[PDB]
DNA sequence: GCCCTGGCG
DNA sequence: CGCCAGGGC
């Protein structure tokens, strides 16, 4: 059934490998619980600036790049997720935000019941200078797992996004 | 399922 | 800034 041992072990591995971490409570929109067709995750600007430089600009409309999404907390097929800069405010329209879509209908990131779930996305840094090519996801499945992270980094509050290099965010394990 | 879009506080 | 959607494909 798991308490939090497997979570903890995965955390230690992320903590000491070359990852940049994004931690949030999934919103109802992220998971699809709203009824909207976003089929993707809202991400803050700083994630793209550090992880996907090639898409970080306004000299082309809606640039995007692909990456492998692998879910570590759930048995779930991998997918080619798509990191996107919706930037139409520069092209005469209204959008100016970043997104990752294409998790798959069966992902915990597309399950309406994980709304409010404490999630951690571990982006694998490109040590050779380009775009992140891979993200490992963990959606906490219980309050037990939530306590491990929240004990370590403080409470995670909807809207209040946490991101940073693994060695810093998870240094307190 | 996913594209790209606009609106709300 | 994050989140709430949805027409059209």
Report resolution in angstroms. Answer: 2.5
Could you give the CA distance from residue A15 to residue A12 in angstroms, rounded to a whole number? 5
Chain B nucleotides close to protein (CB under 7 A) are 1-7
**What are phi and psi for residue A85, nearest 5 degrees?**
-105, 95
Residue whose Cα is closest to the C1' of C1: A44
Q: What is the DSSP string of A126-147?
A: -TTSS---EEEEEE--SHHHHH
Strand order in the sheet with A40-43: A40-43, A97-101, A79-86, A64-71, A134-139, A118-124, A19-25, A162-165
Q: How far is the CA of A94 from the C1' of B6 (A)?
A: 7
Report the Cα A23 to chain-centroid distance in Å: 7
Do A69 and A96 touch, CB atoms closer than 8 A? no
CATH class of the domain at A1-173: mainly beta
Q: Where are the domains of chain A?
A: 1-173
Instruction: Name the closest nucleotide to A106, judged by C1' and CA.
Output: B1
Q: Enter the tokens of residue A104.
A: 């798959």
Pairing label, strands A64-71, A134-139 = parallel
Residue whose Cα is closest to the C1' of C3: A29
Structure obtained using: X-ray
């Amino acid at each position: 059934h798991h308490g939090s041992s497997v979570f903890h072990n995965w955390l230690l591995e992320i903590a000491c490998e070359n990852y940049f971490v994004y931690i949030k409570r999934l919103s109802a929109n992220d998971t699809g619980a709203t009824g909207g067709h976003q089929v993707g995750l809202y991400i803050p600007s700083g994630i793209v600036e550090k992880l996907f430089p090639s898409i970080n600009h306004t000299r082309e409309l809606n640039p995007s790049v692909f990456l492998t999404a692998h879910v570590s907390s759930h048995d779930c097929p991998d997918s080619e997720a798509r990191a996107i800069y919706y930037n139409s405010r520069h092209f005469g329209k209204t959008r100016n935000e970043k997104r990752i879509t294409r998790w798959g209908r069966g992902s915990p990131l597309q399950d309406p019941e994980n709304t409010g779930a404490l999630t951690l996305l571990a982006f694998k840094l490109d040590e050779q200078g380009g775009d992140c090519k891979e993200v490992n996801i963990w959606v906490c499945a219980s309050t037990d797992e939530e306590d491990v992270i929240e004990t370590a980094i403080g409470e995670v509050i909807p809207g209040a996004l946490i991101s940073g290099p693994a060695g810093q965010i998870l240094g307190g394990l």
